[PDB]
Design a protein around this ligand. Sequence first.
Ligand SMILES: Nc1ncnc2c1ncn2[C@@H]1O[C@H](COP(=O)(O)OP(=O)(O)OP(O)(O)=S)[C@@H](O)[C@H]1O
Ligand SMILES: Nc1ncnc2c1ncn2[C@@H]1O[C@H](COP(=O)(O)OP(=O)(O)OP(O)(O)=S)[C@@H](O)[C@H]1O
Lengths: 347, 352
Amino acid sequence: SALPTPHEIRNHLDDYVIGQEQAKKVLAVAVYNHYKRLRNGDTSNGVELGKSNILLIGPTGSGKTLLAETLARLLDVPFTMADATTLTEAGYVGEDVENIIQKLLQKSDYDVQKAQRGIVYIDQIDKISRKSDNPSITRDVSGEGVQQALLKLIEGTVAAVPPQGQEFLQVDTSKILFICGGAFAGLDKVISHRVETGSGIGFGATVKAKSDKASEGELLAQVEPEDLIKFGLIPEFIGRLPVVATLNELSEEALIQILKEPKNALTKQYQALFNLEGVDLEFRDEALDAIAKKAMARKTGARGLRSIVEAALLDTMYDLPSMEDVEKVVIDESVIDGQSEPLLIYG
Amino acid sequence: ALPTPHEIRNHLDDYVIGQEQAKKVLAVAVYNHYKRLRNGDTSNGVELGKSNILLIGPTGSGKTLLAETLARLLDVPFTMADATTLTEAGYVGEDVENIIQKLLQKSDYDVQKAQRGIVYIDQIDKISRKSDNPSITRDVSGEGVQQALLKLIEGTVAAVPPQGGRKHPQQEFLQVDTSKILFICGGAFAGLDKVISHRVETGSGIGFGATVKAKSDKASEGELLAQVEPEDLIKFGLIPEFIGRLPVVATLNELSEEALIQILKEPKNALTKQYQALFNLEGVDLEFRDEALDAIAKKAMARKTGARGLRSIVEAALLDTMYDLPSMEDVEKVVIDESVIDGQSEPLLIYG
Ligand SMILES: Nc1ncnc2c1ncn2[C@@H]1O[C@H](COP(=O)(O)OP(=O)(O)OP(O)(O)=S)[C@@H](O)[C@H]1O
Ligand SMILES: Nc1ncnc2c1ncn2[C@@H]1O[C@H](COP(=O)(O)OP(=O)(O)OP(O)(O)=S)[C@@H](O)[C@H]1O
């Protein structure tokens, strides 16, 4: 009963994700090492084995949420996908932190011994951060307060969970892994202050003003915990998440592979959408390069790609069901620009 | 015979390093708790007092670790609760009495054995009153929790449903005294250094006569917390009536460059021993030369996160090696060099 390896688990995520080689290594080692700590019954010399959570950081639509979703498929141990926006500071009307553990049991069928060895993922983590409110004039119930509650959850404790909705079940969390990730906004500006040192207003001071500092791919790599403190996160919270994963923006070359290599790509989606209708679909390489340039200008990422395709094919889809004897559709580069219309084959 | 402070401290030293004054406070309390417990109103003196503990220190200093290691050697029951999940006597979050309920689970519902137990609370700063908040409001999380704990630290009796009850039929509760129960509250306070500076330095004068700050780095956190007093905590948000219940105070100094080196080798549960055991099952050995450990100390202190921010320095380095180590075969030992920590070199692998 040999366990999988990082090279093996990386091959699975590579089929669904592209151009995130640095981040996939982190999830592979954590998942790999998670089975090792579970394999040991706390009997070896290395008693009280340490834990190492993960903090995923990337631009918008870079594929953070997709990694955690595809991971749960091949994962044997349970998995959940919660959100931090709905949390509150232990007593307000929104929600409690313990609800995350409740969702985990639904996947494990209320198996405590099986749920303790599970994995947890959190999305939209940047929402819980002091918005330039370090003095803390008032208490943030949806922000700072949430981080304070999660502090003990990442270390390990026991939390009451109503089974099935006057007793409660205790579920340890010292061995549970957490993968928190949320695209941070404005983080590039704070990191620039530490490394720019280029105000240059006086005579002696030097003003670079080359506009090259705004390189997200190269700027996030230089991140550190101190940079997050100025953002709003508490140091106590970051210490619970030692590992950090930085994701690069999507380049023009990477976007082309997203439409062909992944099985769940949009090209294969529409290909099957028309397959049921008895019509073939095609996408030439000349059209893919033009779509990549149009998406990067939108500053939205992979998620802002459907707007380029659906808008281009909206007119064709409207009149396609009424049309008969059409077996194939070809989309040229001019169609995206709007100069020409898609070519339809009859037969 | 009962344990001794030197013996109980020698045990904690195996799991904790670089905290001399903090270990002394816990030893005297535990050593004195058995005395008050052994002779309850069975001596010439009567009305034996009590002295709780208030642990204060930076992040990753070892506050939560002392409570865990203490439970291993402690005979009487012990628990590890939290203050973030508490509400003010009626709201939806939680009641203060849940702390006593958790104590009975470990004591097997032994009321006589539960009153003689010890209690620990973590993250006490999270219930600190916001000094200047809107007057028309109610701080159920921060002010209410302190108000509720007042009678608890002093001594009272609280209703506790035993086992939760089978149904409405029972509708009874058990009384559990708390006058003899010890409480060890602790939590990293944020912004406390700024409060002591205003009271101690009393400068920040732009004028000529006023003395301006000599350097940017001043008022060392370790040396600044030592000058703490109860009046400082009042400006933080705590109520004097609550702090009066916790007379003893312990100031934990931040980590030192030499202390971090000892934490990886002297303790039994050190990270080096953890990773060594991680590869021991894999049939692979490991090495960590002192030339690399001292270099890691500079990287950790730069983060200003504490000992808990050390895994980021190690796992970020060994991420590449662990990724391809299982696929590789005929490898028996691994060597770690100083350059690898810097990132300019690749760790050497010993074939076999
Ligand atoms: N590498 C990728 N390969 C293929 N599709 C991708 C990739 N990255 C993103 N996508 C697409 O983008 C969609 C959403 O990606 P997400 O994982 O949500 O990105 P994100 O960083 O999580 O954005 P946020 O943080 O949720 S606003 C996916 O369902 C895919 O359709
Ligand atoms: N003196 C020490 N010796 C060895 N390891 C230590 C020491 N102090 C801290 N550590 C390490 O730091 C980890 C956590 O320390 P903690 O006691 O949780 O710090 P902390 O101040 O309690 O964190 P808070 O209270 O949530 S801000 C331990 O599991 C150890 O790995």
